[PDB]
Design a protein around this ligand. Structure first.
Ligand SMILES: CCCCCCCC/C=C\CCCCCCCC(=O)OC[C@H](COP(=O)(O)OCC[N+](C)(C)C)OC(=O)CCCCCCC/C=C/CCCCCCCC
Ligand SMILES: CCCCCCCC/C=C\CCCCCCCC(=O)OC[C@H](COP(=O)(O)OCC[N+](C)(C)C)OC(=O)CCCCCCC/C=C\CCCCCCCC
Ligand SMILES: CCCCCCCC/C=C\CCCCCCCC(=O)OC[C@H](COP(=O)(O)OCC[N+](C)(C)C)OC(=O)CCCCCCC/C=C\CCCCCCCC
Ligand SMILES: CCCCCCCC/C=C\CCCCCCCC(=O)OC[C@H](COP(=O)(O)OCC[N+](C)(C)C)OC(=O)CCCCCCC/C=C\CCCCCCCC
Ligand SMILES: CCCCCCCCCCCCOCCOCCOCCOCCOCCOCCOCCOCCO
Ligand SMILES: CC(C)CCC[C@@H](C)[C@H]1CC[C@H]2[C@@H]3CC=C4C[C@@H](O)CC[C@]4(C)[C@H]3CC[C@]12C
Ligand SMILES: CC(=O)N[C@@H]1[C@@H](O)[C@H](O)[C@@H](CO)O[C@H]1O
Ligand SMILES: *[C@@H]1O[C@H](CO)[C@@H](O)[C@H](O)[C@H]1NC(C)=O
Ligand SMILES: *[C@@H]1O[C@H](CO)[C@@H](O)[C@H](O)[C@H]1NC(C)=O
Ligand SMILES: *[C@@H]1O[C@H](CO)[C@@H](O)[C@H](O)[C@H]1NC(C)=O
Ligand SMILES: *[C@@H]1O[C@H](CO)[C@@H](O)[C@H](O)[C@H]1NC(C)=O
Ligand SMILES: *[C@@H]1O[C@H](CO)[C@@H](O)[C@H](O)[C@H]1NC(C)=O
Ligand code: ALF
Ligand SMILES: [Mg+2]
Ligand SMILES: [Rb+]
Ligand SMILES: [Rb+]
Ligand SMILES: [Rb+]
Ligand SMILES: [Rb+]
Ligand SMILES: [Rb+]
Ligand SMILES: [Rb+]
Ligand SMILES: [Rb+]
Ligand SMILES: [Rb+]
Lengths: 262, 987
């Protein structure tokens, strides 16, 4: 015997396994009830999503954040940055956008009925050519070969989030520390002003807009000096976007080290 | 040769044995040689292990070591992770630190448990003379006591303490106090005569440290140092190996169960971790997490807080503990061994019986006079009282009118002291009465006369007679009487009276009592005018043909509360043994008086005299009681002592050496007893050190007796032992309640990690938060179960079987760990997926989600709805997970602490709310919770989140379920006390 007899061992096992089945059943039921609680289109609460995050491409991380460094003289130092930039843009090709539609309103694209196919709502097209000089055409080196690179600023989507009506949310990139010896960060943004059209909002969730694609803005940095380490902060200027959070550097802004070697 | 034989040697041999002179002492040279051979005449102080090596051991232990390892992994991880410039988690620093605090804070709890922290040999060499007078080369002088060596010729006197173990060569009216050997302060005579086989009983051995009460003597030093009888008593006390209290054993056993489970859990999943493709360094961190989750960090702390509050309660009944462990032991005690004098008895000679008017009367011998008195209407009695009052020379020291008569200090031997106290109790003021009858003549008590006599003017102005009053040994008082007072009239002492007297005398003799006769004779004015000149050297008065009045007998009587205390113990299943150095006849009388020997119990000697058959034909089983003297004990074998203990349930050991007390305690221990020992004397210290708990009287106790004790009765109220029994049985019953409550929440702190590892869901419960539950939120509730009352009639139950009834057993552990604990983890996970989904993460998305969840290069992860998420926003939602899991556990610890209130009884009869301290602990529990949740800042200091009301509600059906489940369980065992349900599911 290892604590009981061979029949006392079986009768306790049967009880514990019974206990465990019933409790697993009660649990499985709780989860099931929970899932008819849940609407597949709009989340119940958005507590951690008060302000949208911001990301950039190409995302290359060192330690402690985004660090991007390449040699203009060597084409092979920026090849991968181009490559990830091109490879990211593939979902924004005219064919990739076959599920979205032409949006002209330049106002919030509110939809209540699901008139799009398979009982969904329509989503607005955003095609890579809307980034113009930073679309990979005619310059497939996306600004890098010439020492004036493009970074694309993407605002994290959030269901029914509206960023403010008075204008479209805009990107602004400036140096984090204005250099005492130098002038402000000079940048041209595509589309003009660096705006996200209002009709890309609200997001209605992957189930309602499966073909939804985030509008982008490219930030063509024109000013940045060679062989010096800089830090660039791109903030979203929108009424309901904040970038003040000290426990989330990516809330409402994105910052990156940049060095352009020669 | 340790043993003294020198009492049975001639001077010729003693001189040859020691190369000394019986009249000139040792030669000065040989003295100083012998001093280098034997060392000083002193007791060696065995160094107790230094104070801080005491604190180091507290740091070690099954639970203490796992914390060490875990803190080390935290450092190693912290170093490795920071040696690659990752400043992102100092959690593994603070985790390491907090653990170390816990290890150290826990080890501090263990070390400060021992309030006393003192060494016994300190008190023993406070019993020792500093000087001695010695003769060497026929020159007597005063030497330092330590310089004596075996062979030295030593001169003692009254007032001085005896400088070594002495073989007495010549003596002049010399008496000693041997109470440090026997517990008995009755003076003993020292002569050079060999009067016993034992050197402990012969007259020509005097003992180191004993007090020479009077006289002078010379004698040879036959032992010094630790070889003296006091040095051996001391060794026996110091040299007792430090065995573990009953509750220390219990704590260690439960700890062994936990540490074993922790290593097994931690090690099997480390394997599983590595088997499903984690890196060794990460699995090493899981091992640390699993250990931190499963181990109850706050447990040992809660246990000693519960003991602290029992110690607090005992101390208010004047019962003082020296170490928190001692607060449990009397609850587990099953045999009490008790010294008779000054523990059971008052250590004060008290008038006990009187023979007058042909009948034995019983005096009230209680210290508070709370007893039964005797008839005092008699005129024979009024006369005897006159005699024992006038014929007394003792005196109350003045200003004692505030003092109780028994406590009053009086100048006189024990005997006259008792008579005087007895007279002031019986009549208003004995000294005032005596002065009214002025003492014309007196002869004090004499060795040749063998009585004491005095003659007195009487109080009546009209009455001119002189009354002679006398006392002494009864037979020898009676051989000077011609008549006797009987029922007022005075009758000639005929043969029938003389025989009546003799039976009364021997009767009180048989009660282990000292006996005195008392006679009178009224002298007429015809032969003795009012101013007659009574001359003692002339014997111009009579000393024969007196009138007998009565016998008076006296004993050291029980303390008032002691006989009931003994029955209460026996009622609670505890055996009670008397172990005294006093003489058997007294010991047996007192054993009966106090309840150690039941009314109707016979010894085999008792039976033999009733049936008038020889004792060797009495069937030993038929006798319930037994009285074994030390000499018999010395003669016995251990199998015989055991055979006696098994056979006679009412046992008296009298005339026992200090070692013999130890040997009795130990014998009971080897038989399976948890043994307590109650004593007040130096000769008790070995028995005290070796019991599982030793109790000393605070007042009549000796220093060595109090020093070796674990517990001290500050008011000398023996009934406090009964309290200790109860509080011990309570605290044990209630500790399994806290331990059960504290352990049960470990399983839902574990399972989140087991799932996290094996399912790669985002981490549900972090370490920092566990520690908060373990060391803060649930601490007060677990302690409050200390206050819980008894479910059963605790004092009528037998002492628990130490081998099969343990603080934590498999049924308690399994039920709490795998049933209640399991329900709690299903509640946790139910609230986890509830809060994840209501925040955008459906359960199926959580499986395998961990890598992306925990990735800092992934600032736009998509949730179930397609919403993109930063690492930050994900991190705070992870904290929200930690919090819902936290409050699921808290809400269940309300259900949990409620169902722990009772192990047998339903919560519907005892109620929920009679334990007041527990409900404040529940309320403090929920307050400290809401603070951690809704205090601002809390998400960034302690990772706690202001959850929504809904997620407090989620685990309540599980808490309610727990209550209903346990309630149903407990009813099952009340209605089926023999069934399988009871067998397997009662904890
Ligand atoms: C000692 C031995 C212990 C034994 C313990 C065993 C524990 C396992 C018990 C049960 C297993 C899980 C049961 C899941 C029940 C699913 C019920 C159900 O039908 O729900 C639906 C979801 C699918 O959603 P949908 O596609 O309809 O959503 C679409 C959105 N809408 C609904 C709006 C359309 O089904 C699903 O999620 C399927 C995926 C379920 C997620 C798995 C989660 C893994 C976590 C396990 C932790 C358990 C710990 C237990 C603690 C024990 C202590 C010892
Ligand atoms: C007494 C001792 C007993 C020991 C018992 C051992 C028995 C179990 C042994 C083997 C189980 C079968 C293994 C299944 C086949 C291999 C699956 C596999 O190759 O997965 C490996 C992954 C690791 O690579 P990755 O895909 O994450 O890389 C991502 C890379 N990045 C992070 C850069 C993106 O694993 C992860 O880390 C994340 C998990 C994702 C894959 C799911 C695998 C889970 C399967 C089984 C676990 C069940 C164990 C239960 C045992 C409980 C005993 C009480
Ligand atoms: C002291 C006593 C405590 C007792 C507790 C002991 C705990 C020991 C239990 C171990 C059970 C481990 C179960 C491991 C299950 C792994 C399932 C799995 O690795 O399967 C893969 C899919 C997950 O989805 P995916 O591969 O597309 O995600 C990856 C998406 N990618 C490819 C784009 C990156 O699983 C699916 O489809 C659905 C699979 C549903 C899994 C439910 C598991 C619940 C089990 C136990 C609770
Ligand atoms: C031996 C008998 C003891 C237990 C008997 C009582 C249990 C059932 C009785 C009452 C259940 C409710 C108890 C009161 C506390 C509410 C807990 C709760 O509301 O829990 C429901 C959760 C999902 O929360 P929700 O989305 O409905 O919150 C709605 C919040 N609002 C309305 C603001 C949007 O799902 C779940 O626990 C599962 C819900 C289905 C009920 C299964 C009970 C399982 C218990 C074990
Ligand atoms: C045998 C019995 C077994 C069953 C056990 C039953 C036990 C019963 C225990 C009772 C517990 C009482 O619970 C109190 C619950 O407190 C919930 C607090 O609700 C707050 C809900 O609001 C959600 C918080 O919102 C987050 C954002 O807050 C912004 C607004 O805040 C207003 C100001 O508050 C500042 C802090 O949030
Ligand atoms: C529920 C399923 C998945 C697990 C089944 C595994 C079996 C073998 C496990 C689960 C619960 C376990 C039991 C839990 C409770 C007890 C009672 C205790 O006094 C001794 C251990 C013992 C007897 C365990 C033995 C092994 C056990 C029966
Ligand atoms: C106004 C405008 O930009 N039109 C273009 C056109 O090339 C295309 O055919 C149309 C689809 O209907 O959407 C886009
Ligand atoms: C649903 O509609 C989409 C339109 O985007 C179509 O491509 C797809 O084939 C449809 N799926 C089914 C199962 O009908
Ligand atoms: C963008 O392209 C146009 C067309 O060639 C060109 O004139 C303009 O200078 C470009 N802008 C930048 C910043 O390169
Ligand atoms: C912006 O939003 C509100 C509601 O969406 C609308 O009523 C308001 O007129 C809008 N303002 C402008 C300036 O268009
Ligand atoms: C945005 O660009 C427009 C040109 O369309 C220009 O008139 C305006 O000044 C720009 N906005 C700001 C804030 O500079
Ligand atoms: C860039 O490349 C050239 C040659 O390919 C090299 O000489 C130069 O030093 C490089 N720049 C830096 C900053 O290293
Ligand atoms: F008081 Al004792 F043995 F009875 F020391
Ligand atoms: Mg005594
Ligand atoms: Rb703003
Ligand atoms: Rb000699
Ligand atoms: Rb723990
Ligand atoms: Rb006295
Ligand atoms: Rb007189
Ligand atoms: Rb002891
Ligand atoms: Rb002991
Ligand atoms: Rb004493």
């Amino acid at each position: 015997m290892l604590g009981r007899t061979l029949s006392r061992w079986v009768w306790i096992s049967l009880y514990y396994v019974a206990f465990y089945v019933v409790m697993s059943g009660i649990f499985a039921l709780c989860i099931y009830v929970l899932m008819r609680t849940i609407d597949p289109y709009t989340p119940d609460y958005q507590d951690q999503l008060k302000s949208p995050g911001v990301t950039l491409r190409p995302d290359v991380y060192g330690e402690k954040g985004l660090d991007i460094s390449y040699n203009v003289s060597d084409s092979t130092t920026w090849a991968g940055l181009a490559h990830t930039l091109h490879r990211f843009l593939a979902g924004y090709s005219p064919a990739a956008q076959e599920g979205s539609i032409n949006c002209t309103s330049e106002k919030y694209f509110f939809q209540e009925s699901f008139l799009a196919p398979n009982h969904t709502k329509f989503s607005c097209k955003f095609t890579a050519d809307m980034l113009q000089n930073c679309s990979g055409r005619p310059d497939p080196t996306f600004g890098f070969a010439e020492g004036k690179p493009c970074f694309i600023i993407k605002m994290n989507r959030i269901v029914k989030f509206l960023p403010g009506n008075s204008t479209a949310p805009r990107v602004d990139c400036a140096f984090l520390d204005q250099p005492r010896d130098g002038p402000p960060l000079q940048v041209e943004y595509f589309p003009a002003n660096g705006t996200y059209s209002l009709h890309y909002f609200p997001y209605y969730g992957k189930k309602a807009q499966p073909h939804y694609s985030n509008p982008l803005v490219a930030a063509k940095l024109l000013n940045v000096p060679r062989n010096r380490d800089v830090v660039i902060v791109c903030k979203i200027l929108a009424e309901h976007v904040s970038f003040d959070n000290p426990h989330d550097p990516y809330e409402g802004k994105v910052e990156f080290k940049l060095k352009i070697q020669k | 040769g340790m043993e003294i034989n020198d009492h049975q040697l001639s001077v010729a041999e003693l001189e040859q044995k020691y190369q000394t002179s019986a009249t000139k002492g040792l030669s000065a040279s040989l003295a100083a040689e012998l001093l280098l051979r034997d060392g000083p005449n002193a007791l060696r102080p065995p160094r107790g292990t230094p104070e801080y090596v005491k604190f180091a051991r507290q740091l070690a232990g099954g639970l203490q070591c796992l914390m060490w390892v875990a803190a080390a992994i935290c450092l190693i991880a912290f170093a490795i992770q920071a040696s690659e410039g990752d400043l992102t988690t100092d959690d593994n620093l603070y985790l390491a630190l907090a653990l170390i605090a816990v290890v150290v804070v826990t080890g501090c709890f263990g070390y400060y448990q021992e309030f006393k922290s003192t060494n016994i040999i300190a008190s023993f060499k406070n019993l020792v003379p500093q000087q001695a007078t010695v003769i060497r080369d026929g020159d007597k002088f005063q030497i330092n006591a330590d310089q004596l060596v075996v062979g030295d010729l030593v001169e003692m006197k009254g007032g001085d303490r005896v400088p070594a173990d002495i073989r007495i060569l010549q003596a002049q009216g010399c008496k000693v106090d041997n109470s440090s050997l026997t517990g008995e302060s009755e003076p003993q005579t020292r002569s050079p005569e060999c009067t016993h086989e034992s050197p402990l009983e012969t007259r020509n051995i005097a003992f180191f440290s004993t007090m020479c009460l009077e006289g002078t003597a010379q004698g040879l030093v036959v032992n010094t140092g630790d070889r003296t009888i006091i040095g051996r008593i001391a060794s026996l006390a110091s040299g007792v190996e430090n065995e573990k209290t009953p509750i220390a054993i219990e704590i260690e056993h439960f700890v062994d169960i936990i540490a074993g489970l922790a290593i097994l859990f931690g090690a099997t999943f480390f394997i599983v971790a590595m088997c499903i493709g984690y890196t060794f360094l990460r699995a090493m961190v899981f091992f640390m997490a699993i250990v931190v989750a499963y181990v109850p960090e706050g447990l040992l702390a809660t246990v000693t807080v519960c003991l602290s509050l029992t110690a607090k309660r005992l101390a208010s009944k004047n019962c003082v503990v020296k170490n928190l462990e001692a607060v449990e032991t009397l609850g587990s005690t099953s045999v009490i061994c008790s010294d008779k004098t000054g523990t059971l008895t008052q250590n004060r000679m008290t008038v006990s019986h009187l023979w007058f008017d042909n009948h034995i009367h019983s005096a009230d011998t209680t210290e508070d006079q709370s007893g039964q008195t005797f008839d005092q209407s008699s005129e024979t009695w009024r006369a005897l009282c006159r005699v024992l009052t006038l014929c007394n020379r003792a005196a109350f020291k003045s200003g004692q009118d505030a003092v109780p008569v028994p406590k009053r200090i009086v100048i006189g031997d024990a005997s006259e002291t008792a008579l005087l106290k007895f007279s002031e109790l019986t009549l208003g003021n004995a000294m005032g009465y005596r002065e009214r009858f002025p003492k014309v003549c007196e002869i004090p008590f004499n060795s040749t006369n063998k009585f004491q006599l005095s003659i007195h003017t009487l109080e009546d102005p009209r009455d001119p007679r002189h009354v002679l009053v006398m006392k002494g040994a009864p037979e020898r008082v009676l051989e000077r009487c011609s008549s006797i007072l009987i029922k007022g009239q005075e009758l000639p002492l005929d043969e029938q009276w003389r025989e009546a007297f003799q039976t009364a005398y021997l009767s009180l003799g048989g009660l282990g009592e000292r006996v005195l006769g008392f006679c009178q004779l009224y002298l007429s004015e015809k032969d003795y005018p009012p101013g007659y000149a009574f001359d003692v050297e002339a014997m111009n008065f009579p000393t024969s043909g007196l009138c007998f009045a009565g016998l008076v007998s006296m004993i050291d009587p029980p303390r008032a509360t002691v006989p009931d205390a003994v029955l209460k113990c026996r009622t609670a299943g505890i055996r009670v043994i008397m172990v005294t150095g006093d003489h058997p006849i007294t010991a047996k009388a007192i054993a009966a008086s106090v309840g150690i020997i039941s009314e109707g119990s016979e010894t085999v000697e008792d039976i033999a005299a009733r049936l008038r058959v020889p004792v060797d034909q009495v069937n030993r089983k038929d006798a319930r009681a037994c009285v074994i003297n030390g000499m018999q004990l010395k003669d016995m074998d251990p199998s015989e002592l055991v055979e006696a203990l098994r056979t006679h349930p009412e046992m008296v050991f009298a005339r026992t050496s200090p070692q013999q007390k130890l040997v009795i305690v130990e014998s009971c221990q080897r038989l399976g007893a948890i043994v307590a020992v109650t004593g007040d004397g130096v000769n008790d210290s070995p028995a005290l050190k070796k019991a599982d708990i030793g109790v000393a009287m605070g007042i009549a106790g000796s220093d060595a007796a109090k020093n070796a004790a674990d517990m001290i009765l500050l008011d000398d109220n023996f009934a406090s032992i009964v309290t200790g029994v109860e509080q011990g049985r309570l605290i044990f019953d209630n500790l399994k309640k806290s331990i059960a409550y504290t352990l049960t929440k470990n399983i839902p702190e574990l399972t989140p990690w087991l799932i996290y590892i094996t399912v790669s869901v985002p981490l549900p419960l972090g370490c920092i938060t566990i520690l908060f539950i373990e060391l803060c939120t649930d601490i007060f509730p677990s302690v409050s179960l200390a206050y819980e009352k008894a479910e059963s009639d605790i004092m009528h139950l037998r002492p628990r079987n130490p081998k099969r009834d343990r603080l934590v057993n498999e049924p308690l552990a399994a039920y709490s760990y795998f049933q209640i604990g399991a329900i709690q983890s299903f509640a946790g996970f139910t609230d986890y997926f509830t809060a994840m989904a209501q925040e955008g993460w459906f359960p199926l998305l959580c499986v395998g989600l961990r890598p992306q969840w925990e990735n800092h290069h992934l600032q736009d992860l998509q949730d179930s709805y397609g919403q993109e998420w930063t690492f930050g926003q994900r991190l705070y939602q992870q904290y929200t997970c930690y919090t819902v899991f936290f409050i699921s556990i808290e809400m269940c610890q309300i259900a949990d602490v409620l169902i722990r209130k009772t192990r047998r009884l339903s919560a519907f009869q005892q109620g929920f709310f009679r334990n007041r301290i527990l409900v404040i602990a529940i309320v403090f529990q929920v307050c400290i919770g809401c603070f951690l949740c809704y205090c601002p800042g809390m998400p960034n200091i302690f990772n706690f989140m202001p959850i929504r009301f809904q997620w407090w509600l989620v685990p309540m059906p599980f808490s309610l379920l727990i209550f209903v489940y346990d309630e149903i369980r407990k009813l099952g065992v009340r209605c089926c006390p023999g069934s399988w349900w009871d067998q397997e599911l009662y904890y």
